């Protein structure tokens, strides 16, 4: 992992949310470049989210 810097539409929306609803954030990118689907795992013949 390397610390890069992110910005854009979603980051501005998140900053506005943190301003309105008083909380602090720690942003990190998802390990793989996948949004997420229910995929079959090759162990136990199960389905899981990635």
């Amino acid at each position: 992992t390397v610390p890069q810097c992110c910005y854009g539409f979603c980051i501005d929306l998140l900053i506005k949310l943190a301003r309105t609803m008083n909380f602090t954030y720690e942003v990190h990118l998802v390990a793989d470049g996948k949004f997420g689907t229910q995929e079959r795992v090759n162990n136990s013949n199960k389905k899981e989210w990635n």
Partner: protein
């Protein structure tokens, strides 16, 4: 011997191989029915068969 879980797995394989995907579970208060129902539900939920 075979535990009730393995017998349930074989029964589900039987139902799958003959395309009997619609079924009902009828049990009494006989001991071991809790584990039987739990295993059947767990196998059904973590399955892509439908």
């Amino acid at each position: 011997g075979a535990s009730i879980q393995q017998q349930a797995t074989v029964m589900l394989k039987i139902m799958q191989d003959y395309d009997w995907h619609v079924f009902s579970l009828v049990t009494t208060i006989f001991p071991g029915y809790r584990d039987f129902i739990s295993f059947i539900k767990t196998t059904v939920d973590n399955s892509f068969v439908g």
